[PDB]
Amino acid sequence: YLTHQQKVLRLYKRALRHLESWCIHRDKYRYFACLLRARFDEHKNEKDMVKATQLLREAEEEFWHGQHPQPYIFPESPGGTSYERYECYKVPEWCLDDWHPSEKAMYPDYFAKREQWKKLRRESWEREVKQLQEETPVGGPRTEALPPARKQGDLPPLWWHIVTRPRERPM
Amino acid sequence: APPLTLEGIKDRVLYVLKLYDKIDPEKLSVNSHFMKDLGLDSLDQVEIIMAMEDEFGFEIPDIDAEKLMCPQEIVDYIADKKDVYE
Amino acid sequence: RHSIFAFTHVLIPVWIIHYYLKYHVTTKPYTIVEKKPRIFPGDTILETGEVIPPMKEFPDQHH
Amino acid sequence: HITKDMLPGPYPKTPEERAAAAKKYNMRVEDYEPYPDDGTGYGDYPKLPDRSQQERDPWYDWDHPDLRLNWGEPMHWDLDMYIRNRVDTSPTPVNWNLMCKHLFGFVAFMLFMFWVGETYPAYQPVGPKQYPYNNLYLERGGDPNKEPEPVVHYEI
Amino acid sequence: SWDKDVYPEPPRRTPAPSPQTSLPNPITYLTKAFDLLVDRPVTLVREFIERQHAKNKYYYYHREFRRVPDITECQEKDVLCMFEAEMQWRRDYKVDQEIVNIIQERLKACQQREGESHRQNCAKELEQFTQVVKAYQDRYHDLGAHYSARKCLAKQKQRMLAERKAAKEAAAA
Amino acid sequence: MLKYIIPTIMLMPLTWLSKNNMIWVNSTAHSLLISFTSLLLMNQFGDNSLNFSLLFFSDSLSTPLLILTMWLLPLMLMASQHHLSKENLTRKKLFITMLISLQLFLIMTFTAMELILFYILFEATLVPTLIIITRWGNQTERLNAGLYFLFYTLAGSLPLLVALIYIQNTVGSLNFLMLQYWVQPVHNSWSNVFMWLACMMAFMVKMPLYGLHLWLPKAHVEAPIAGSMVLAAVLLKLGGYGMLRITLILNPMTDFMAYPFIMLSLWGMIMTSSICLRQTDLKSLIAYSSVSHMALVIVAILIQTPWSYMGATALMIAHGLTSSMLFCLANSNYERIHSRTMILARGLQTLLPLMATWWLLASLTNLALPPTINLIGELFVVMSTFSWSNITIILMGVNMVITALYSLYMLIMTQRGKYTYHINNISPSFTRENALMSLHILPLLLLTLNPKIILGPLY
Amino acid sequence: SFPKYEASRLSSLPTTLDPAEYDISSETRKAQAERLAIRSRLKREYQLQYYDPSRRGVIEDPALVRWTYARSANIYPNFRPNTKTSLLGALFGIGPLVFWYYVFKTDRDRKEKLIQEGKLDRTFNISY
Amino acid sequence: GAHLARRYLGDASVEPDPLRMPTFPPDYGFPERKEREMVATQQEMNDAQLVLQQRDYCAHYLIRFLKCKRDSFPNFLACKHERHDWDYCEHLDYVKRMKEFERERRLLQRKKRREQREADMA
Amino acid sequence: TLCLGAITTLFTAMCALTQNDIKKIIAFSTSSQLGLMMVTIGINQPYLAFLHICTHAFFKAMLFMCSGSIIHSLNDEQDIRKMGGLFKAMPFTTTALIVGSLALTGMPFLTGFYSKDLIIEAANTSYTNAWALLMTLIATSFTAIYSTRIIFFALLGQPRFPTLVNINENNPLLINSIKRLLIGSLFAGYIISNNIPPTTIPQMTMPYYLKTTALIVTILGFILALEISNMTKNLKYHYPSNAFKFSTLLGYFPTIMHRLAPYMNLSMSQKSASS
């Protein structure tokens, strides 16, 4: 669910981005960006929420009519030219467990460090599970938010795959 | 594509905000809440995030962008996406 | 470095190819077939010594 | 592990079967709707919206990011057709019917004009190209024994 | 090597060089480099090999097949006579395939040799190719994958009957 | 053929008398030695077939099928020994025995001189095949798969038995050499229509013919890996080999009796190729791919031209190596993730680089990249079918487009994209797995150098 | 007063253009909360396995098993012969076969008729 | 250009048909017309291996150009005068084809002018 | 083949007029040039079609390498709307890009002139489909427009890329690879044109207007393109038309066919063939 305020702010960002795609030139875009902001400021204070909803629906219809058919997309954003370009290089860390001993002997320092991380994960796991059991209602979790660590020497529950995820430029 | 550093990210984030006419450069620090301290509204914050996307060349999704309320949170968000640790 | 490349990748391959063509391919019929050379008026045939006659006098156009 | 009670079954006839089916598929009983009970064999499988996986939020933390699926959610019957490599159903900036009319109109117009241009070709104001020796009768592979009809060209 | 009558080629006519330019001809100097660096060492190695072969000279023979009675002379269901006739017919069939291949190879060598004048200068090769393909088609076309001498004979007699019928009604006219 | 039959029989005492821990080493080594000696069958003559005795012979049709058969036995032992590792010793030895007995029946099947000897061995292959599917298959569905396999085959083969005995009573012999000289044309009567169907339906079911193929997606999918390898590589080719032989005595009736089966095959290949695009089970997709390829062999055999017969022989050999390789590739993923679902494990190229090369090579041969023998066979059939009727090029062309689509869809879905996050047991490829794949593809590509030895008697 | 959006099977209505998205009663809010609860419960069940340090294998997904089962084994038990299935099966099953039979039978009969009359060009046709 | 408008958007009876011209006899109005001279013999063009479409009434200039090009190698900027003679010979051949078209058009006009005059008599 | 090539050259040139991805513009340029080669086939000029293949290889390859140089310097940005102001920042890529564009548009005596201009002359003087001839000429003008589009937005104006400037085209591998193709884009057409043997009879007699058609429409194309591009810098709003959307979305062919055909085929596979 998106609140009304979230819907308006998403529209404002979308409208500006498509406006920038039309205008291209920076000085021209600055001019029309300020006219568009003025339109949003014109109804900033509209206490009637039935009328503020009607204004929102018409703005979205106006946007769909005016959207650029081929808007600018940041290269690495979904739909961009570089989106997912480096996924083929992302290898999960568990693959290192299958390395041959002669391959591990080339990085004695890296693998000694890695064993400490795996030991840390092993020793934290029981407390992470217990913390989730005790902080979760009887019906079960109602949102996807996870809690922090409440104690000293505890780790935030379910941290391993966030912390150890591949780098964005893994190779 | 030279590498980013934590100080470098912070320097450029604060640099952009000091070019925004609605912010007083003499009252701007890394922990200045955009709304509570600098007295900006939520339309201003959308424009601030858009500038950061332009500054660093990548998109911040609206669901994440709405929570970035101070310069330090912007720095941390960028650092996390770019795997910057120093 | 370039000379070691020329020797291993040009000279030796062309030796093998030339030996292959001269003593295996061209010893069989119709393996290598050349378009016969063009002959122009006034030419001389190397094989025979025949001399090809010239073309007749041109009705000299203005140019 | 999977038991028979966790597997798809026949079309649910009673509201008690519909609730049991919805729970099995991890759906709200109000959101659960089977395919019509024709003879085509869907049983009680949920009829989900016919939307491409391309239509799902790319910024959400999917369990299967490439498929944009979460573990345990009911898969569309035609999921393998709606993967991001195949059929896309995203909204288009131009209406579907208007796109079809403009594409068809452009192609039909071009085909018509090509047919016109073939009926009324462009050419230069020159008579036919002339060739010696009976229009090159022998060069074109003419029978050396048969005598061709003379083709005589004149100055002008 | 090969017989020049089976795989003929006309005499070669090469125009002599007749330059009208002071510039050196790069091909002439590349040709001499090729002879010295490539053709010469390759020729020496070949001569060494041909000396070894001359020390050990042995022979192989082209197998000759005696002619045996053909299918027309075989009595029905007589497998021993049919077998020898059928094997002979298959050997002849494979030979006829190679004859067509020889005639096709002549035709293709002519088209390439004559360049832009091939349409006129290859008329003889085209005529011979046409005649052999007609004869081959008459013998073997449409017999099917299970072809045999018997089916070939049946096809010939059907054709001979048609040619005999087309004559009595072409001599009646 | 006794120089191959007796050594094959000796594989059984070798297996039973071996040390407990050497059953796989011993049987694999000596089955490879038998496969090596089979190259002596390549003494073929231009006119006459190689006729050993009253019982057995080998011509250019059966020789390549024999070499493929004997080659497959060591590959199947390699493919099986991992998933049978926890089986107790006696049951392992019985599993190997079934494989050996199947090889014995097959090599005698392909060289039988007399069609009734061919029949007995042709049915004999059912028994070990059924036992392998039902005893050592993994799922509950193996029992149902065995019944479909058994009764589809027998429903067709029992009418064939009546027909063959009828022919022997009328001709006096079923010896294949004799039938070449004593064959008489088939008059067009109702009684001969059912003789034609009796002589052909058993082979059609084994191909399988589209419509009569439902047993194959069950049997090929439920069998253990060795079962699938032999089922697809060799046993489907008994139908093609039988049809190529028996059509000798069915002319000219085949001219018009072929039409319904040509339509089923030409349209069926497009149907089964389309099915592959929406299959969710990787093994099931590979099984439906076989039906599409064998539809070309049926069509090629029925139009009865020298080019279609060369193409059919090449396709049967080419498909045998390719389909077996694909099953082995699919099995190697199954032994890791224990599921046959194709969408389950993705992006495997990232985790198993070399194995992804085998997938690519297997896929390219499946879609008939030139100059592979897969393409040579398919091309020769397309050429002959164009002469049968120019319009067939449309159906052949559409099938080649669809075949490329599902071949690369299988490659892209499993090997590319992002790996599945929670699957963390994809260990590196074993030397055994890599050798198993290369013993398929290496002979397949080598044959491109000397294709004539797999073009059959019409070459 | 802009022209209205006309959706199709292959081009969906944009979410921002959907009238339902803008009238959100409490019952709709409650439904969304119930959906999030189911997703959250499933996410937790997956994560407790996915994050378990000792687990090595595949996390079996019942939804994936149900999907493959529904697309194969469950179809015939829920099939009923009726007007819809009988007609479609006849039209898609037999239809193409009868059509292609008459295309090839017609083409081959015409071609055969020409060959018997010597009216088909087969001058160089010796491969078949 | 202009001639296409007249045929397509005007009277097509007094415009040549490019696929059927000439339609009048070669001597109609041309007393004692000379035949075109051909310099190169059939054997010379065969020996030179000219492309058949090049074996026209300008072939002798082409042969002279081809011989020069071969003999001037590697100087590919030579034979520029030989090339021009062939280009100019082809230009004159093209003008002769333009005159044939213009002659055909004027006879079609003349033919009509006679019909109307020979019809206004009736 | 004449009509097939004519529709291709026109349709893909029109798509190129509105594309913003630099590689898409060059790709649609290739399709349009291939269409022109197919037209040359259709007017019975196979040796001119071959020559265009040879000349096109030089400057088209160079253009992609120049775009690759720009893409690399702007951290994988391929949208020309985020380029600008590169004329002096990347002098060598600028030089190659201008030479490449002038070669593509048929500037006299560059590599593209020695094939494209003979092709247009041969088409204009041929017994040919009238509509195909017009489509070809218009496509020739559109070639100037989208060539101007790349130069105007990539090189001229003010920078529109991000603030951290990492523009660097000083790698010798980059310089020498482009440099060799630049030399080919100037002289290869002249050298190949003067060394190949004549296999047809070139048409050299035509009215003045049919002799300069290729050059005139190219100049008109540059003029019109330069008026459209300067218009983009006027503080005036945008009103997108049907033609702009048709061009931008590639005539809707991908949007319809790549959804409708897969949907129909994949639905049948499961519903009918499988189930």
Ligand SMILES: CCCCCCCCCCCCCCCCCC(=O)OC[C@H](COP(=O)(O)OCCN)OC(=O)CCCCCCCCCCCCCCCCC
């Ligand atoms: C000539 C061309 C040939 C090519 C065309 C061939 C067409 C295909 C023929 C298919 C044959 C029938 C199908 C065989 C598949 C296996 C059958 C099966 O598995 O059905 C299961 C069914 C369920 O019952 P059940 O399995 O017993 O329950 C569990 C306890 N075991 O089991 C049962 O209910 C009992 C099944 C009994 C049938 C067994 C098979 C016998 C087939 C021959 C039929 C005999 C007809 C004789 C009738 C003459 C008088 C009319």
Ligand SMILES: CCCCCCCCCCCCCCCCCC(=O)OC[C@H](COP(=O)(O)OCCN)OC(=O)CCCCCCCCCCCCCCCCC
């Ligand atoms: C889905 C189940 C899978 C199992 C499939 C089982 C297939 C069994 C097929 C058995 C049919 C055998 C044919 C029996 C009919 C009698 C044949 C006969 O003797 O008729 C002769 C006549 C020949 O015609 P003609 O070529 O003109 O004569 C020579 C002069 N040129 O007859 C003719 O005109 C020749 C044409 C005969 C073929 C007719 C084809 C019908 C249309 C195609 C149907 C495809 C198969 C349909 C299967 C659906 C099953 C549900």
Ligand SMILES: C[C@H](CCC(=O)O)[C@H]1CC[C@H]2[C@@H]3[C@H](O)C[C@@H]4C[C@H](O)CC[C@]4(C)[C@H]3C[C@H](O)[C@]12C
């Ligand atoms: C000629 C080239 C030098 C390029 C350069 O320095 O700019 C060098 C670079 C690397 C060389 C090659 C590689 O070293 C691999 C080869 C190994 C052998 O020692 C010589 C042949 C061999 C095939 C090489 C000879 C060649 O001279 C190469 C290609």
Ligand SMILES: *C(=O)CCCCCCCCCCCCC
């Ligand atoms: C007579 O044969 C004329 C042949 C063709 C005339 C072409 C003249 C160019 C006019 C239209 C070009 C428009 C391009 C924008």
